[PDB]
Amino acid sequence: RMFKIEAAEIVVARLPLKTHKVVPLLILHGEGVQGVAEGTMEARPMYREETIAGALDLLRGTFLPAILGQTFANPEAVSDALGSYRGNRMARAMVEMAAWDLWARTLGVPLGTLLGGHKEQVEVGVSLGIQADEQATVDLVRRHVEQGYRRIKLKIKPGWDVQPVRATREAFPDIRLTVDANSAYTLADAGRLRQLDEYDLTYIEQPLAWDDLVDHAELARRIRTPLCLDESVASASDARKALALGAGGVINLKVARVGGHAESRRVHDVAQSFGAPVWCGGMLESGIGRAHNIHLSTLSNFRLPGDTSSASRYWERDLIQEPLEAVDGLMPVPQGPGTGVTLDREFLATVTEAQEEHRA
Amino acid sequence: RMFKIEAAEIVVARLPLKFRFETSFGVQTHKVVPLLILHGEGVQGVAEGTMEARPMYREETIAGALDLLRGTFLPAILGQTFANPEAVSDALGSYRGNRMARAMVEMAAWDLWARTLGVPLGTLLGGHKEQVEVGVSLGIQADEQATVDLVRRHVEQGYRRIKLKIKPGWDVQPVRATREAFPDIRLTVDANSAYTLADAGRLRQLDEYDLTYIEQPLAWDDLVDHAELARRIRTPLCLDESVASASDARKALALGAGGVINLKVARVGGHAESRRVHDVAQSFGAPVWCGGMLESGIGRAHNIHLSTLSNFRLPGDTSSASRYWERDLIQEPLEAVDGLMPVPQGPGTGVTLDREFLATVTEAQEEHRA
Numbered sequence: 211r212m213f214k215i216e217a218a219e220i221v222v223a224r225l226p227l228k229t230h231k232v233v234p235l236l237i238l239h240g241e242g243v244q245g246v247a248e249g250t251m252e253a254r255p256m257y258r259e260e261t262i263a264g265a266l267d268l269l270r271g272t273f274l275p276a277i278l279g280q281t282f283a284n285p286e287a288v289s290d291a292l293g294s295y296r297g298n299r300m301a302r303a304m305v306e307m308a309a310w311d312l313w314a315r316t317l318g319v320p321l322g323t324l325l326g327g328h329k330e331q332v333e334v335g336v337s338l339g340i341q342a343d344e345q346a347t348v349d350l351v352r353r354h355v356e357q358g359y360r361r362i363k364l365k366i367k368p369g370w371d372v373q374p375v376r377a378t379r380e381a382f383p384d385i386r387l388t389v390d391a392n393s394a395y396t397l398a399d400a401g402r403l404r405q406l407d408e409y410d411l412t413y414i415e416q417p418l419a420w421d422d423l424v425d426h427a428e429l430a431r432r433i434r435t436p437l438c439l440d441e442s443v444a445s446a447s448d449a450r451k452a453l454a455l456g457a458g459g460v461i462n463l464k465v466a467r468v469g470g471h472a473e474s475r476r477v478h479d480v481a482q483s484f485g486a487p488v489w490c491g492g493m494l495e496s497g498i499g500r501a502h503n504i505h506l507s508t509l510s511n512f513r514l515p516g517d518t519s520s521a522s523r524y525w526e527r528d529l530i531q532e533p534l535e536a537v538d539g540l541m542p543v544p545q546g547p548g549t550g551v552t553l554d555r556e557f558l559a560t561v562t563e564a565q566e567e568h569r570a
Numbered sequence: 571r572m573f574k575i576e577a578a579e580i581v582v583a584r585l586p587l588k589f590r591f592e593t594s595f596g597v598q599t600h601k602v603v604p605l606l607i608l609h610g611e612g613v614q615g616v617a618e619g620t621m622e623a624r625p626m627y628r629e630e631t632i633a634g635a636l637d638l639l640r641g642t643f644l645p646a647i648l649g650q651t652f653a654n655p656e657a658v659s660d661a662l663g664s665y666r667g668n669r670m671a672r673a674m675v676e677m678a679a680w681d682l683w684a685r686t687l688g689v690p691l692g693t694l695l696g697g698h699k700e701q702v703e704v705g706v707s708l709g710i711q712a713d714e715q716a717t718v719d720l721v722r723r724h725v726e727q728g729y730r731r732i733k734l735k736i737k738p739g740w741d742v743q744p745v746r747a748t749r750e751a752f753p754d755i756r757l758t759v760d761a762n763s764a765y766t767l768a769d770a771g772r773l774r775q776l777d778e779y780d781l782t783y784i785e786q787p788l789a790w791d792d793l794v795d796h797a798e799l800a801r802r803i804r805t806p807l808c809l810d811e812s813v814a815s816a817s818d819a820r821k822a823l824a825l826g827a828g829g830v831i832n833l834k835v836a837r838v839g840g841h842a843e844s845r846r847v848h849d850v851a852q853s854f855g856a857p858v859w860c861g862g863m864l865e866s867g868i869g870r871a872h873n874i875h876l877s878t879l880s881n882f883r884l885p886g887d888t889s890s891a892s893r894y895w896e897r898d899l900i901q902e903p904l905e906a907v908d909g910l911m912p913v914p915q916g917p918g919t920g921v922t923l924d925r926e927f928l929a930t931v932t933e934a935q936e937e938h939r940a
């Protein structure tokens with residue numbers, strides 16, 4: 211039945227990397243259970259527009275007062291109770307995603323299962339930064355191929371793109387290879403990006419501006435390598451517009467950027483209706499976010515590998531009791547209700563910068 | 571010569587609002603006025619934030635923006651020396667969005683720079699009108715022969731365009747009422763961002779009421795649906811929320827998403843970018859008009875100066891200050907007569923903070939130095 215949101219905690223952690231990362235968490239309490247979600251907004255707006263200070267002020271001053279004490283039928287009803295406000299999708303996603311976890315836990319049912327997924331494991335890829343030269347790129351690719359990753363992504367930039375890609379594909383004729391172009395190109399670079407075409411990249415990720423679709427559509431007329439959109443798809447209607455315009459043929463789907471699981475499933479279904487795949491993007495999540503990501507990724511149109519690689523690659527020690535470790539390019543879905551993971555409250559306390567509790 | 575920003579003050583004020591301003595996204599009765607003052611070369615520049623405490627008109631918030639100013643933009647400029655505002659704007663870096671926040675810095679920089687030269691702001695932006703045409707934007711009304719109360723009052727004052735705020739389902743009513751009680755005025759609506767393509771049939775109804783345009787009928791972040799809606803109806807569409815940069819304006823116009831842009835200086839990142847938006851629109855043969863954000867006289871003055879550029883060919887929302895506040899934060903009156911608002915004289919914005927009055931309605935203040 212229906213669920214009442216009785217209380218909420220905001221906990222900001224400073225989690226040591228394997229030098230630190232600020233992890234904002236929301237915990238929603240109701241019906242004897244709790245839901246947890248992780249904010250992916252940063253202190254300054256670098257990947258996208260939101261910030262921790264804007265987001266938390268929005269939570270504590272607006273979203274939380276709107277839902278505390280109220281009774282809801284499902285997470286969609288929780289989101290609807292916030293809906294006047296414009297943008298701020300990552301802030302919204304904190305509430306929406308904690309709601310999904312809480313709801314799922316009142317039912318005793320895994321999150322992915324309620325979203326309609328039925329994979330027990332999800333394929334994972336790996337992201338490589340810019341290396342000093344070709345052979346150094348190939349060596350690191352060769353390592354990750356031997357570890358069993360199912361997709362290799364190379365970071366590229368003007369002056370360093372065809373070379374790493376050429377050297378890599380020469381050494382690995384059949385692997386799934388992609389590049390992250392990190393909005394560093396313009397339409398003048400069309401001829402240079404077109405030189406990648408002979409290397410059969412599965413896609414080039416967001417080569418032009420972060421909030422553009424229109425110029426992406428033009429670039430896609432000039433090269434044959436498929437484009438993948440990231441920051442410019444923040445909703446199902448964006449997804450529709452991107453695919454119908456021919457802005458790309460693949461979507462990097464990040465649950466929090468689009469406002470949470472319900473809207474993420476909509477992006478996923480829109481893309482599928484165009485027969486375009488999505489894959490799960492990553493944002494250096496602690497185990498809370500990683501676990502939400504893994505559950506979302508069990509949906510059937512996540513047909514390319516996702517950035518939900520091992521937590522040990524990022525954190526000396528994670529915020530959850532359960533280890534999220536990929537083996538042979540496969541990450542298992544964590545067992546249990548909701549996300550299937552559990553905050554380690556004592557460890558969390560040792561790295562808590564700040565916390566607060568709100569009631570009705 | 572170059573200028574050095576030696577210090578910066580953030581001053582947050584609150585002013586009561588004379589009329590109740592409904593709109594499709596809420597109802598507003600007060601206004602928070604975040605001010606930025608930059609100090610250098612013995613003068614100061616002042617600009618006013620147009621972000622709200624909660625993201626209702628658009629995505630930015632006061633808390634987010636002030637935090638961004640104090641933690642990032644101000645540190646990046648304080649103690650630095652610049653050739654022009656463009657250089658200041660370039661020193662803020664590569665952060666994404668947050669145009670209104672940037673605009674506080676950029677517009678204050680323009681005022682400061684204008685004041686070092688002793689030249690009016692408008693003049694330095696290329697404008698040479700000495701007064702600007704203005705209309706009024708009215709909030710949500712009551713019926714066919716009693717919505718005209720608020721409109722009668724404004725036509726008697728000579729406002730050059732009347733703009734009715736609307737929403738579902740309060741649109742063809744309020745307009746019908748107004749248009750035969752007053753069959754000849756330039757009339758428009760602010761469909762304010764509330765409809766979808768589903769409602770196209772409802773909006774083609776407005777075509778028989780002879781509007782200059784329908785403002786932002788569909789989603790605040792959309793251009794593609796607008797382009798489609800424009801094919802289906804004869805009334806020009808005006809974009810507001812959807813155009814936050816010059817490249818946005820180019821994409822909107824190339825797509826045919828609108829034929830008119832409501833240019834809000836702060837929404838697009840400040841004066842330089844507004845000049846660019848202005849010039850892109852003109853190159854497509856589309857006019858702009860100056861939008862409003864319930865500004866104190868600091869923001870209203872900046873708007874009047876920008877409005878002196880030549881593609882501001884439709885009346886703006888820059889109505890008389892005394893409509894809004896019992897008392898403004900500046901010493902000078904900014905009052906239109908017969909739909910004409912004169913350009914306030916002096917260097918930069920040509921207006922001046924009334925520091926004593928501002929202190930009685932300040933709720934926050936901080937000073938930042940190198």
Ligand SMILES: CC(=O)N[C@@H](CCC(N)=O)C(=O)O
Pocket residue numbers: 593627707760861862863864865887
């Ligand atoms: C936020 C927005 O609704 N404000 C008014 C501006 C007119 C007046 N408010 O200055 C507008 O019509 O744009």
Ligand SMILES: [Mg+2]
Pocket residue numbers: 390415
């Ligand atoms: Mg990527």
Ligand SMILES: [Mg+2]
Pocket residue numbers: 760762785810
């Ligand atoms: Mg408006």
